[PDB]
Amino acid sequence: KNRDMPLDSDVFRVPPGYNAPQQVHITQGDLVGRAMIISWVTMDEPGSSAVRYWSEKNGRKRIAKGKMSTYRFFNYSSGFIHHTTIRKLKYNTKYYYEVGLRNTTRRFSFITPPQTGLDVPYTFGLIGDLGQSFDSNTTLSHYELSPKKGQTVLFVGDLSYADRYPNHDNVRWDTWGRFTERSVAYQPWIWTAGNHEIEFAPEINETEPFKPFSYRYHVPYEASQSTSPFWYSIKRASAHIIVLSSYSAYGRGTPQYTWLKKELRKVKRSETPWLIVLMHSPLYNSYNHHFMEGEAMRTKFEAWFVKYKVDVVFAGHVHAYERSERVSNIAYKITNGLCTPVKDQSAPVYITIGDAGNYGVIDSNMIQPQPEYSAFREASFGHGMFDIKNRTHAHFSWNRNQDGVAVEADSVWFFNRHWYPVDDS
Amino acid sequence: TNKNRDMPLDSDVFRVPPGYNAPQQVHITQGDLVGRAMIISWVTMDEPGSSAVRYWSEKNGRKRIAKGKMSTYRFFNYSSGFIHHTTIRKLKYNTKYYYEVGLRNTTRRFSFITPPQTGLDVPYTFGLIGDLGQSFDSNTTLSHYELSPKKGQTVLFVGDLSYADRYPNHDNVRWDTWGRFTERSVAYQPWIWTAGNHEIEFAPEINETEPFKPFSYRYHVPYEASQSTSPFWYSIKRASAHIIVLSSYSAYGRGTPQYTWLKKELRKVKRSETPWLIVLMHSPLYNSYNHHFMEGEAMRTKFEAWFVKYKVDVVFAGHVHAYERSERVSNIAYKITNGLCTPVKDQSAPVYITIGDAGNYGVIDSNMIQPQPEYSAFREASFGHGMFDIKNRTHAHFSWNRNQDGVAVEADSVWFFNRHWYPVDDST
Numbered sequence A: 001k002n003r004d005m006p007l008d009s010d011v012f013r014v015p016p017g018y019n020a021p022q023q024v025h026i027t028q029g030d031l032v033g034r035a036m037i038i039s040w041v042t043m044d045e046p047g048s049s050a051v052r053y054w055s056e057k058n059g060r061k062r063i064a065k066g067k068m069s070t071y072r073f074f075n076y077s078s079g080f081i082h083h084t085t086i087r088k089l090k091y092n093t094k095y096y097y098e099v100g101l102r103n104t105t106r107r108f109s110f111i112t113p114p115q116t117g118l119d120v121p122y123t124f125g126l127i128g129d130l131g132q133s134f135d136s137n138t139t140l141s142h143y144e145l146s147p148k149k150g151q152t153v154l155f156v157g158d159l160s161y162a163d164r165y166p167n168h169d170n171v172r173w174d175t176w177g178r179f180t181e182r183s184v185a186y187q188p189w190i191w192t193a194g195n196h197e198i199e200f201a202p203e204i205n206e207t208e209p210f211k212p213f214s215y216r217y218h219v220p221y222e223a224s225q226s227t228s229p230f231w232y233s234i235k236r237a238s239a240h241i242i243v244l245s246s247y248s249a250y251g252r253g254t255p256q257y258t259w260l261k262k263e264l265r266k267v268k269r270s271e272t273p274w275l276i277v278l279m280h281s282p283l284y285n286s287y288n289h290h291f292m293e294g295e296a297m298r299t300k301f302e303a304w305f306v307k308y309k310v311d312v313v314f315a316g317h318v319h320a321y322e323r324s325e326r327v328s329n330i331a332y333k334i335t336n337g338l339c340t341p342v343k344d345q346s347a348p349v350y351i352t353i354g355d356a357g358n359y360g361v362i363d364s365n366m367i368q369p370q371p372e373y374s375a376f377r378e379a380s381f382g383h384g385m386f387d388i389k390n391r392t393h394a395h396f397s398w399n400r401n402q403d404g405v406a407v408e409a410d411s412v413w414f415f416n417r418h419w420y421p422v423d424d425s
Numbered sequence B: 001t002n003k004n005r006d007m008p009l010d011s012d013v014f015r016v017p018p019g020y021n022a023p024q025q026v027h028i029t030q031g032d033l034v035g036r037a038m039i040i041s042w043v044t045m046d047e048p049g050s051s052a053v054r055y056w057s058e059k060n061g062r063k064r065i066a067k068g069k070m071s072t073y074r075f076f077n078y079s080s081g082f083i084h085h086t087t088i089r090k091l092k093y094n095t096k097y098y099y100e101v102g103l104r105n106t107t108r109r110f111s112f113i114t115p116p117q118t119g120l121d122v123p124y125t126f127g128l129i130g131d132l133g134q135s136f137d138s139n140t141t142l143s144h145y146e147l148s149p150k151k152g153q154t155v156l157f158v159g160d161l162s163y164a165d166r167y168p169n170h171d172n173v174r175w176d177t178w179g180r181f182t183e184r185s186v187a188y189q190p191w192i193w194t195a196g197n198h199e200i201e202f203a204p205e206i207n208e209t210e211p212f213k214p215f216s217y218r219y220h221v222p223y224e225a226s227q228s229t230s231p232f233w234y235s236i237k238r239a240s241a242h243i244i245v246l247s248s249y250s251a252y253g254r255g256t257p258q259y260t261w262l263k264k265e266l267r268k269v270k271r272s273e274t275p276w277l278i279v280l281m282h283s284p285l286y287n288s289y290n291h292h293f294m295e296g297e298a299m300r301t302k303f304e305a306w307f308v309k310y311k312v313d314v315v316f317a318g319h320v321h322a323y324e325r326s327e328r329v330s331n332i333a334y335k336i337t338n339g340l341c342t343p344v345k346d347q348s349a350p351v352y353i354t355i356g357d358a359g360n361y362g363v364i365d366s367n368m369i370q371p372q373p374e375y376s377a378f379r380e381a382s383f384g385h386g387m388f389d390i391k392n393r394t395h396a397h398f399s400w401n402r403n404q405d406g407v408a409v410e411a412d413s414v415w416f417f418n419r420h421w422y423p424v425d426d427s428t
């Protein structure tokens, strides 16, 4: 039943050297891709928050300075968490960066995206509910061996599953950071907050929602004028990506509601044709597990997604894969009986991709027969790839952990809802 | 937009209590779970002053001192005066107490009457006031409440207090005036506070990004007494009623603090101690007015089935500037593809009452969905207030009084039959 990887697993090895940086991870640090947040932990002493970096093209070494933080959770004391934003990066350029400049230096690299534009191709990985089981490791292996070559991971929430351990044993956040480093140190992952990040534990006097996650994983939320790390937007290549918080407030007048309504107004499909929404809890879901948990946010935001021609909504939370038809359920007025989802070519596709591994359990129970709103579903571990070719075409594919790394078990062409709104069913 | 109907600053209801550093904007609310405590609140403008409260019952008369805390805030270019909150505890039930504030310079005296101990057949009269504001209509509603022959003993307040956020930069002076205006009631009987959308004051354009800041500095609630982690949701018991206060503009997704709190809190209700189970929220789950139609749908998906499972007697809300009383219905059978989305009569469900018509800034919400739906019993766009008069464990009498009527006329009334002790069809 415990399918979590043991503490002495190779993927959790501590990088050697006195105060060697560990749990190194990067994410986009600005609105348009010219910056990068570099994050890592030192365990032996605070160390330096400086990052040394240079482009392959110019080879000029520069230093950026950041900030160190620590937290406590019950009887756990963290190591020294560093976050440093490197700025004014050149587009479409390979950079190297080094952390741990005082004692044990470690070097990594990333490639900045091209400048935002109509036809800029870009390959997004889709990972959800990863955890640290053996299944999780297989999914990560399949992602990094994919011939499609993902360039940025859109991560739809539920990271370490540390909160399943006694007192949320936050050592299991540290192991998760060491395990995922082999990917996220070299390409950004775009973070969404899920229910396993809430860690609301009044019984051990831990009452601040999202505390361990928010200390460890920073996002560039001020760059889209959000007032909270849990909802924010970034642009990358031909995509505008909106990250939402299933477990924050979204009533009319609340910060998240206000921010999203204004952010949708700011989207420019003439600059980023692909409009992508990330959230943890799926609004369309025909699995037994968490059935209808997404109704609340759906009543608030579904009609806006249709009005603004969102291309696709990605969610996790359900430990399985599902791809909806383009559907809407926005005509209900309490007493008019109109509560059945209908085919709606102006609506986004809703994809559930929470099947990366969690702690080793798949959600296999489905409502039968498959409802008309659901196009394809399967209870298998795996990951997705959203591969943009240009302003009109993107190719989505789903890869199963039991298939070869080059095998797509589901795949479908997306026709852009703004630039090429022809029926893609 | 809209003609300015707010009472002007030199109005008599806004007069400053005289004397150097005289306490103003005095208000009280229940300070504990069961009614043996009171939070005393007030503002001093000239200097910090003392947070001490001198209090004594009229029977014995032994004078005691409770020590509280002082705080201040800024909002854009506004700086608050000095805000005091002080909790008097271990009071005797059903007892008149005198209390005094301003002990260093200008003392002012007030009084309150503690409720009886909680119990199955304890009568008690609650006023219902929503979306009050500080227009001339607001002043009439409060006058009608004060003059009611039924004698309200505690106000259940369903949100939208001062409407200060309608002024430029939310001119927080209009919080002070509202405090001075409502003192003539709330300094002498508790008002039970619910947070509405006008308390959010989310104003990133002037760098004020902390939800509820002015409200939460000025109005405290005994939220830790029900083991809540936030002032915006909590519960209290008073006489024969168990009152649950919820926050429409906080998170209530599964696993969130409020959601988790409410689910545990409902399990603590014991209808043999407090037979009347009452919920307050700002945004109504049932509402057949065009203004804010279906805004309550999100919370309804999370909580309506719980209200029916625990046989809540009544849910009070404001937000819509009008009056409405539902039938006992539920709409909890929907499963996406089973097509069951019409409310049905359900004798385990509460009655939903919208009572957000106390005045606001002088505007009534008169556009209604047509025809009146089956789930709506009575609706009318008039300014007024309600009274929930508990007689015993089986009967409570609700009445609605209109500002255009005499203070003793009820344009709507209905006997509530208790859902635990007497679940009889009380419709119409």
Ligand SMILES: *[C@@H]1O[C@H](CO)[C@@H](O[C@@H]2O[C@H](CO)[C@@H](O[C@@H]3O[C@H](CO[C@H]4O[C@H](CO)[C@@H](O)[C@H](O)[C@@H]4O)[C@@H](O)[C@H](O)[C@@H]3O[C@H]3O[C@H](CO)[C@@H](O)[C@H](O)[C@@H]3O)[C@H](O)[C@H]2NC(C)=O)[C@H](O[C@@H]2O[C@@H](C)[C@@H](O)[C@@H](O)[C@@H]2O)[C@H]1NC(C)=O
Residues within 6 Å of the ligand: A075, A076, A166, A167
């Ligand atoms: C943060 O708080 C956590 C919760 O308190 C700490 O974890 C607890 O740490 C205590 C140690 O103080 C553990 O208790 C001990 O468990 C010993 C284990 O022996 C077991 O080994 C065999 C292996 O085959 C088992 O099959 C069998 O169960 C056997 O008992 C035990 O020998 C000790 O007696 C001791 O106390 C046990 O006895 C009590 C007396 O009645 C029992 O009531 C109780 O069941 C105790 O287990 C405890 O198990 C552990 N709890 C959990 C949930 O993990 C944590 O401590 C840190 O982590 C643990 C795992 C240890 O390594 C500990 O040394 C370390 O400090 C705290 N962390 C920090 C940083 O402070």
Ligand SMILES: *[C@@H]1O[C@H](CO)[C@@H](O[C@@H]2O[C@H](CO)[C@@H](O[C@@H]3O[C@H](CO[C@H]4O[C@H](CO)[C@@H](O)[C@H](O)[C@@H]4O)[C@@H](O)[C@H](O[C@H]4O[C@H](CO)[C@@H](O)[C@H](O)[C@@H]4O)[C@@H]3O)[C@H](O)[C@H]2NC(C)=O)[C@H](O[C@@H]2O[C@@H](C)[C@@H](O)[C@@H](O)[C@@H]2O)[C@H]1NC(C)=O
Residues within 6 Å of the ligand: A389, A390, A391, A392, A393, A413
């Ligand atoms: C935006 O991106 C999308 C997705 O990539 C583009 O759509 C693709 O466009 C390419 C062309 O650029 C299409 O590939 C071409 O397909 C034809 C037809 O293939 C079929 O028929 C063959 C016989 O006719 C058959 O043998 C074959 O197996 C298949 O069944 C191929 O003939 C063609 O290959 C030949 O031409 C190229 C070009 O010189 C040579 O290099 C080859 O050696 C061959 O001689 C080529 O592979 C592809 O099918 C499209 N994909 C999809 C999913 O539609 C899109 O292009 C635009 O839209 C398509 C539909 C066409 O109208 C394009 O011409 C058009 O540009 C991109 N949009 C823009 C504006 O670029």
Ligand SMILES: *[C@@H]1O[C@H](CO)[C@@H](O[C@@H]2O[C@H](CO)[C@@H](O[C@@H]3O[C@H](CO)[C@@H](O)[C@H](O)[C@@H]3O)[C@H](O)[C@H]2NC(C)=O)[C@H](O[C@@H]2O[C@@H](C)[C@@H](O)[C@@H](O)[C@@H]2O)[C@H]1NC(C)=O
Residues within 6 Å of the ligand: A018, A102, A103
């Ligand atoms: C972690 O990294 C710091 C900074 O690089 C180390 O501190 C530095 O250690 C050097 C030893 O190689 C010190 O310089 C040496 O001084 C001698 C004569 O004093 C000179 O020949 C020449 O300048 C040498 O480089 C240097 O002063 C020191 N810098 C400080 C303390 O700011 C640190 O070394 C460890 O801590 C210091 C306090 C010493 O005790 C070292 O022996 C010890 O290894 C590094 N820490 C570890 C654990 O490796």
Ligand SMILES: *[C@@H]1O[C@H](CO)[C@@H](O[C@@H]2O[C@H](CO)[C@@H](O[C@@H]3O[C@H](CO)[C@@H](O)[C@H](O)[C@@H]3O)[C@H](O)[C@H]2NC(C)=O)[C@H](O[C@@H]2O[C@@H](C)[C@@H](O)[C@@H](O)[C@@H]2O)[C@H]1NC(C)=O
Residues within 6 Å of the ligand: B020, B104, B105
């Ligand atoms: C508001 O209330 C404060 C506190 O009561 C007043 O300040 C206090 O004034 C006392 C004199 O009335 C000061 O007396 C001190 O104690 C003994 C007697 O107990 C004196 O014999 C001795 O000389 C001390 O000075 C007391 O120090 C002072 N407390 C403070 C300042 O914290 C205040 O009075 C105003 O300020 C004081 C300083 C005097 O100048 C008064 O004339 C003046 O009115 C009160 N303010 C007002 C406007 O009423």
Ligand SMILES: *[C@@H]1O[C@H](CO)[C@@H](O[C@@H]2O[C@H](CO)[C@@H](O[C@@H]3O[C@H](CO)[C@@H](O)[C@H](O)[C@@H]3O)[C@H](O)[C@H]2NC(C)=O)[C@H](O[C@@H]2O[C@@H](C)[C@@H](O)[C@@H](O)[C@@H]2O)[C@H]1NC(C)=O
Residues within 6 Å of the ligand: B391, B392, B393, B394, B395, B415
């Ligand atoms: C709880 O409180 C309700 C409301 O006050 C009680 O119901 C009321 O009981 C009164 C008896 O004390 C009734 O008054 C009498 O009415 C007749 C007309 O039929 C008059 O001629 C007579 O002079 C009295 O005025 C009153 O009508 C009634 N009100 C309602 C709305 O029903 C209730 O009493 C209990 O239930 C009622 C239905 C009767 O069975 C009563 O006998 C019985 O005690 C109170 N319940 C409890 C448990 O205390």
Ligand SMILES: *[C@@H]1O[C@H](CO)[C@@H](O[C@@H]2O[C@H](CO)[C@@H](O[C@@H]3O[C@H](CO)[C@@H](O)[C@H](O)[C@@H]3O)[C@H](O)[C@H]2NC(C)=O)[C@H](O)[C@H]1NC(C)=O
Residues within 6 Å of the ligand: B007, B011, B012, B013, B136, B139, B140, B143
């Ligand atoms: C708000 O409503 C209240 C209650 O209806 C009004 O109170 C009335 O105003 C003052 C007290 O605030 C009282 O004034 C009295 O009348 C003469 C003037 O004719 C005055 O000179 C006397 O000294 C005396 O105090 C009046 O009796 C009182 N009425 C009551 C308590 O029933 C208040 O005016 C209203 N304010 C606004 C702005 O609408």
Ligand SMILES: *[C@@H]1O[C@H](CO)[C@@H](O[C@@H]2O[C@H](CO)[C@@H](O)[C@H](O)[C@H]2NC(C)=O)[C@H](O)[C@H]1NC(C)=O
Residues within 6 Å of the ligand: A005, A009, A010, A011, A134, A137, A138, A141
């Ligand atoms: C997780 O998956 C990786 C990648 O498949 C495994 O990496 C292997 O590590 C061993 C020793 O650590 C090497 O000898 C192999 O060459 C690696 N395999 C590949 C394909 O690179 C890793 O062992 C897995 N860890 C766990 C705990 O399952």
Ligand SMILES: CCCCCCCCCC(=O)N[C@@H](c1cccc2ccccc12)P(=O)(O)O
Residues within 6 Å of the ligand: A252, A253, B197, B292, B321, B360
């Ligand atoms: C379907 C028609 C348009 C959608 C709803 C817009 C109309 C609501 C605005 C209003 O007419 N009234 C209330 C109000 C005040 C201030 C902020 C509000 C934010 C959201 C809501 C109300 C607010 P009110 O002024 O009555 O308090």
Ligand SMILES: CCCCCCCCCC(=O)N[C@H](c1cccc2ccccc12)P(=O)(O)O
Residues within 6 Å of the ligand: A158, A164, A195, A196, A290, A317, A318, A361, B254, B255
């Ligand atoms: C059966 C005991 C063995 C281990 C149990 C640990 C499983 C926790 C994580 C999980 O497997 N499921 C979460 C979940 C499941 C069921 C109900 C839930 C209700 C509220 C929130 C989450 C819920 P998750 O958030 O991951 O879906």
Ligand SMILES: *[C@@H]1O[C@H](CO)[C@@H](O)[C@H](O)[C@H]1NC(C)=O
Residues within 6 Å of the ligand: B204, B205, B206, B207
């Ligand atoms: C305060 O006001 C506006 C917020 O929209 C902005 O121009 C200014 O930079 C803000 N100051 C901050 C965020 O420090």
Ligand SMILES: [Cl-]
Residues within 6 Å of the ligand: A019, A047, A048, A099, A100, A101, A102, A103, A104
């Ligand atoms: Cl270092």
Ligand SMILES: [Cl-]
Residues within 6 Å of the ligand: A250, A251, A252, B248, B283, B295, B296
């Ligand atoms: Cl809402």
Ligand SMILES: [Cl-]
Residues within 6 Å of the ligand: A246, A281, A293, A294, A296, B252, B253, B254
């Ligand atoms: Cl939810």
Ligand SMILES: [Fe+3]
Residues within 6 Å of the ligand: A129, A158, A317, A318, A319, A354, A358
């Ligand atoms: Fe999960």
Ligand SMILES: [Fe+3]
Residues within 6 Å of the ligand: B131, B160, B318, B319, B320, B321, B356, B360
């Ligand atoms: Fe209102």
Ligand SMILES: [Zn+2]
Residues within 6 Å of the ligand: A158, A194, A195, A196, A280, A316, A317, A318
């Ligand atoms: Zn989840």
